[PDB]
Amino acid sequence: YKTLRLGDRGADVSYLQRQLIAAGARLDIDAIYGSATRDAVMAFQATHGLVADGIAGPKTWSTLSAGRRDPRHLTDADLQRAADRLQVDLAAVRAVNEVESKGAGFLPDGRPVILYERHIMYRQLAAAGLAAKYPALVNSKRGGYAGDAAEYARLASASQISGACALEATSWGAFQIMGFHWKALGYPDVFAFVDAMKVSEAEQLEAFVRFVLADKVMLAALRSKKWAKFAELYNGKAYAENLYDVKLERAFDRYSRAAA
């Protein structure tokens, strides 16, 4: 089923509303995904170990249609743990998770979502002591991305140049944490970092938590709900073009309201 959210209308919404009612909700079946429908999705998610974001996406649909929950998927309780780790208001963590996560931390084939960065590979190889031989894989210029499972082909090729460097030059999981942070974030080595990324979305969120903890300016921005500053630090100079700042701000308002 297609992902549904606040403001959606139509046959897919009435189908959702019926499924929510079958799972115990009380709703008017009017094909309008308004606040009552959103609240019901949230209540359903919370009670079935999903992330309670009020968005009926593929994870919610899977539980709602088949009663299945993948144990690799992030839960509400993981977000509460992250809020405790960060000393950040839970609503702020929920907002960050909604806006900044890729959502699914794993590809359909079960491996973590990755993006291999040939310009970082270039950098890690130089620091360890090729760009002409393998220009798509090693390059001072950014890019060459394939995406999705095809990234693993690029990673596999890079790994044959240097296994540690290639993992360091790749971003991992739902928050796309660069492997080269493994040391800064207190992991034993890059292989252990990657192994953790393969276990669960909870581990992928833990990487994000550590990443934020390692940058006190970023941490402070998050704690103080300085969304534009957090987005600039986290997403980079082009944060505004994708509305990260305002999406965070408006998500946080939603979650602050919901918790009240």
Residue numbers in the entry: 2 to 130, 136 to 266
What does the study report here?
In the present study, we describe a modular endolysin (rare for Gram-negative infecting phages) originating from B. cenocepacia AP3 phage. The structure of endolysin, predicted in silico in BLASTP, is modular, consisting of CBD (10-65 aa; PG_binding_1 domain; pfam01471) at the N-terminus, and DUF3380 domain (pfam11860) at the C-terminus (90-262 aa). Thus, comparable to lysozyme, AP3gp15 cleaves β-1,4-glycosidic bond of PG and releases GlcNAc and MurNAc. Similarly to others, the AP3 endolysin shows a broad spectrum of activity against Gram-negative strains, but no PG-degrading properties with respect to Gram-positives.
The overall structure comprises of two clearly distinguished domains, a smaller N-terminal CBD domain (Lys3 – Ser66), and a larger EAD domain (Asp77 – Ala264) located towards the C-terminus. CBD domain is composed of a bundle of three antiparallel helices (α1-α3) and is joined with EAD via a hinge region spanning amino acids (Ala67 – Thr76). The EAD domain is organized into two sub-domains: first encompassing helices α4-α5 (Asp77 – Glu101) and helices α10 to α15 (Gly185 – Ala266), and the second containing β1 (Ile115 – Tyr117), β2-β3 (Thr176 – Met184) sheet intervened by helices α6 to α9 (Arg119 – Ala175). The structure of the EAD domain of AP3gp15 is characterized by a deep concave cleft at the subdomain interface. Despite a relatively low homology of amino acid sequence (31% and 39% identity, respectively), a high structural homology of the entire AP3gp15 N-terminal part to the domains of clearly identified function strongly suggests its role in PG interaction. The large enzymatic C-terminal domain of AP3 endolysin shows structural homology to proteins of lysozyme family. The comparison to HEWL, the closest structural homologue among lysozymes, allowed to define the core structure of AP3 endolysin, where the entire fold of HEWL is encompassed within α5, α10, α12, α14 and α15. This core is decorated with large protrusions (α6-α9) characteristic only for AP3 phage endolysin and not present in classical lysozymes. The crystal structure analysis suggests that only a single catalytic residue (Glu101) is present at the active site of AP3 endolysin. Experimental data of AP3gp15 mutant Glu101Ala with a decline in activity by 99.4%, confirmed of Glu101 involvement in the catalytic reaction.
